Amino acid sequence: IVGGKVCPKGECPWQVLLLVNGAQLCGGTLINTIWVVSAAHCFDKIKNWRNLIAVLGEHDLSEHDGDEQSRRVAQVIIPSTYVPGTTNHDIALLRLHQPVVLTDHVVPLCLPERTFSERTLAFVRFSLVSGWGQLLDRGATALELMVLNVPRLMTQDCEASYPGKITEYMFCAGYSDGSKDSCKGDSGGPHATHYRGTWYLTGIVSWGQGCATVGHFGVYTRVSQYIEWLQKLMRSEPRPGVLLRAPFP
């Protein structure tokens, strides 16, 4: 996260940390005790799917205070329409092998209905994005969870920054003055929108041209397009093999 602030311990309770071989990979969003939403591109290069780990209730990576809960990722589900090395359909649904326990420091973000997200949440100006990613473009990652308030754009207003590159499965958020943005390592993290006392999942940190670069915005995966797809899969019975390309729509 560039130009943000440390998220106070417990105030971003749905934030997930994904590790591979103990190494920092990406962020993610808990939406119930079993299921986590992340970015598809985070998994382009996994060699050993058995060493894939999700950590909840995390805050400081350099310390262990006892609120952390680790779970093995039993399944990574990705839209069949997603193509590794490209931007479109950058979303993944992760099944934890065992559910996490909900606590003051571990709580799911709500997955909204499509209509509600399209009609109401889409027009809430600001939303929070968070992660342990780079503090600057091509800089070092953060040890403490970082958070950032960013404004949302409809795509005609983003069109100039990314001509013919923003699909209906994306949206832009951030600042063209090059001061605040999500960044490498924040992928899969929530873009979370508050409405009437409750927080909802509206976006996923996906991609951008640099980080907080003048004249450009962060690009986020438009979660509203995947509500139906996500809910159908949360009902499907588990299958052998960690990775799974599920048809979209």
Binding site: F123, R125, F126, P151, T167, E168, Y169, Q225
Partner: protein
């Protein structure tokens, strides 16, 4: 090409009565308007209308010093990855709303002096279930210019006031006509109102 984007978005605003106007007349499509401040949520108005206008008064009077942006969505008729839209110019009500035509409330004469009182024009800014006056909103920012003359006046004379009354000197036996103009000297655009209807002794 199920819809066409609106265009020539224009703010029509007088005493804070603020209407957004656009083209074209709807063909097989309907419009929805949104308005916001630079950092506020979007508020929708005039849902699925076939009008080429939208009254946004109740939104802008909430804070007339804020700078507002509106946008008109085009929806295909009967079929209500986003809809086409167009952005309005930015609009700051306190600085841009047209001062309405003033009106002379009264004028009294005694001796070689005359009072000319301007009616305190009420605006569309509601507060406590009542409409605030033009001077309630602008205070010292607002002045009035009095034009006054007689049948034999080679030219109109001018007076000015920080309030709503003029106290001028006149010739004993002569009848004068009057006309007032509302001015906000600090403005850069729409600095002056139109002239008031003329009242004569």
């Amino acid at each position: 090409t199920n819809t066409v984007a609106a265009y020539n978005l224009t703010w029509k605003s007088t005493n804070f009565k603020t209407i957004l106007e656009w083209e074209p007349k709807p063909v097989n499509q309907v419009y929805t308007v949104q308005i916001s401040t630079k950092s506020g949520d979007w508020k929708s108005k005039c849902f699925y209308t076939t009008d080429t206008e939208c009254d946004l008064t109740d939104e802008i009077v909430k804070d007339v010093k804020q700078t507002y942006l509106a946008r008109v969505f085009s929806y295909p008729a009967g079929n209500v990855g986003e809809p086409l839209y167009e952005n309005s110019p930015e609009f700051t009500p306190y600085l841009e709303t047209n001062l309405g035509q003033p009106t002379i409330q009264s004028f009294e004469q005694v001796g070689t002096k005359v009072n000319v009182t301007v009616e305190d024009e009420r605006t569309l800014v509601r507060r406590n279930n009542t409409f605030l006056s033009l001077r309630d909103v602008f205070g010292k920012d607002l002045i009035y210019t009095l034009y006054y003359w007689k049948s034999s006046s080679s030219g109109k004379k001018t007076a000015k006031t920080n309030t709503n009354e003029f106290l001028i000197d006149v010739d004993k036996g002569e009848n004068y006509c009057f006309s007032v103009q509302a001015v906000i000297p600090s403005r850069t655009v729409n600095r002056k109102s139109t002239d008031s209807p003329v009242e004569c002794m």
